[PDB]
């Protein structure tokens, strides 16, 4: 026995004396073996969801999850049911699929899970300090209340002619169109739609000055910041490379530009109700009396604009891509436009937009088939018991909810991979609570989150951009439809999504051919 412990020490001594070829080998062999041995032992636990088996330690199932997460989820669901875990670049992700998973994650108690712990490294290096996920949840709650204050029906009534003007200016001036000189052409929708999205969102949310900045070489800083918004930040939020230096420079340069305008407005008492900058200047005091700083206001503007940027641009790209092979839908949308707008002799308004159910259904169905965020995360902060099961999700795990997966299940949407706006006949609203409501600090929202359709999430982290997105996408598509027909180049079809980008944007290049419905039509104004 004691003789055995001497040979332990002797063996530790011969271990250290191995050739570095074998020391390195054992430094790879041993973690690999322990990994398999640990999973086998882990698979015995009754109080843990099944864990997806994986060969490479730390890396885990990262590759297949990034490649095709919904296909990854469907196979895991067939072997294990609706709750299962997998490891992901160092973390254990516990997936809860379906409406009860929406309920488990979106309505989790604030003490149990943390969104800022999952997201802060993704967003803080892009947006700046102090806001969104670089702050306590109750600060986020009031930030959402401040922003929502500029997102009112009356705000939407004035945004509509502004967004319309921007769309027409883009048809007139952009290289991709020039409708006054060309009656047909080919565009890449991942080129045109990010540009149309930033032009229209700038003009309406940021205001006339910040929109004017985009006609200068200042627009290059927006490109730099936009490039810093990448899921690489989940792993490498700060690397001493040039990518990160352009991003950081841009955040300072852009937030400096907003602080410049904010300070000029306050210095001149020029604070109105024009844009979200005005609104946050008048309404950014937290409930404990602390005011947001001009730096925090500008970082919140960056965040709101940048999140809205990627979700909205991806969605209008998909709308265009689904309609390019559906000339029947384009025709039906065109007729609705002629009826609602008296043949075009009525100007588009926010209220008339609400009388365009097929247009809004087309947005709604695109968001069904293309949730821009396939996976939403929380870090588990206290152990969580999974109701009706033996499972306990321990602190340090992550929970993963995926309403976009349920969007594509035939159980809840018959023929789920068919694009059919008519599945929403009589139900064209962007969403609506099926019953009771609750207020986390930014307005009463649906208490239950068991709806199989959840493009905007639910609970305390629920989107507040839904009506701005519909207003923006609504004006934009109304004008596209009334102005152009479009179709695919020959043999091309809807592309598959890129599930490794920030949003589930289409795999490019994704080109459509447009044509003027009225070749002789000319867009006025000066260029
Ligand atoms: C390593 C080998 C490699 C090979 C090649 O496979 N590989 N292997 C694996 N993968 C891989 C695997 C998975 C992924 N990602 C999964 C995670 N996704 C993701 C994206 C965004 C997320 O957003 C978090 C918040 C929520 O709200 C937002 C956004 N927002 C809401 N409304 C408007 N904006 C928000 C809110 C408020 C604001 F004010 C602002 C905001 F922005 C931000 C959360 C999750 C990205 C894709 C990527 C790659 C690989 O590439
Ligand atoms: C197609 C358009 C959009 C979709 C599908 C969408 C989706 C979502 C989802 C699913 C969440 C919840 C994330 C989570 O629970 O982890 C969210 C949150 C949020 N979104 Fe959007 N969004 C869209 C557009 C916008 C726009 C246009 C804005 C701003 C103008 C915006 C601002 C926000 C904010 C401020 C939050 C709250 C983040 C939090 O509380 O953690 N979104 N959105
Ligand atoms: C006897 C018949 C007489 C008929 C009288 C008719 C009165 C009509 C009154 C219209 C009310 C709209 O008036 C005003 O609209 C603006 C929108 O630009 C709103 O402004 C709102 O959106 C803007 C733009 O994001 C934000 O900067 C602002 O913080 C927000 O509150 C005002 O909060 C609202 O007060």
Automatic annotation (TrEMBL):
Heme binds at residue 463. It catalyses: a 14alpha-hydroxymethyl steroid + reduced [NADPH--hemoprotein reductase] + O2 = a 14alpha-formyl steroid + oxidized [NADPH--hemoprotein reductase] + 2 H2O + H(+); 32-hydroxylanosterol + reduced [NADPH--hemoprotein reductase] + O2 = 32-oxolanosterol + oxidized [NADPH--hemoprotein reductase] + 2 H2O + H(+); lanosterol + 3 reduced [NADPH--hemoprotein reductase] + 3 O2 = 4,4-dimethyl-5alpha-cholesta-8,14,24-trien-3beta-ol + formate + 3 oxidized [NADPH--hemoprotein reductase] + 4 H2O + 4 H(+); 32-oxolanosterol + reduced [NADPH--hemoprotein reductase] + O2 = 4,4-dimethyl-5alpha-cholesta-8,14,24-trien-3beta-ol + formate + oxidized [NADPH--hemoprotein reductase] + H2O + 2 H(+). The chain crosses the membrane at residues 24-44, 51-67. Its EC number is 1.14.14.154. One of its GO terms (cellular component) is membrane. This is sterol 14alpha-demethylase. InterPro entries: CYP450_sterol_14alpha_dmase, Cyt_P450, Cyt_P450_CS, Cyt_P450_E_grp-IV, Cyt_P450_sf. It holds the Pfam family p450. Its cofactor is heme. Heme b binds at residues 119, 133, 144, 378, 461, 463. Belongs to the cytochrome P450 family. The keyword Isomerase does not apply. GO terms for molecular function: heme binding; iron ion binding; methyltransferase activity; sterol 14-demethylase activity. Coiled coil: none annotated. The lineage of its organism: Eukaryota, Fungi, Dikarya, Ascomycota, Saccharomycotina. It is an enzyme of class 1 (oxidoreductase). Keywords: Heme, Iron, Lipid biosynthesis, Lipid metabolism, Membrane, Metal-binding, Methyltransferase, Monooxygenase, Oxidoreductase, Steroid biosynthesis, Steroid metabolism, Sterol biosynthesis, Sterol metabolism, Transferase, Transmembrane, Transmembrane helix.
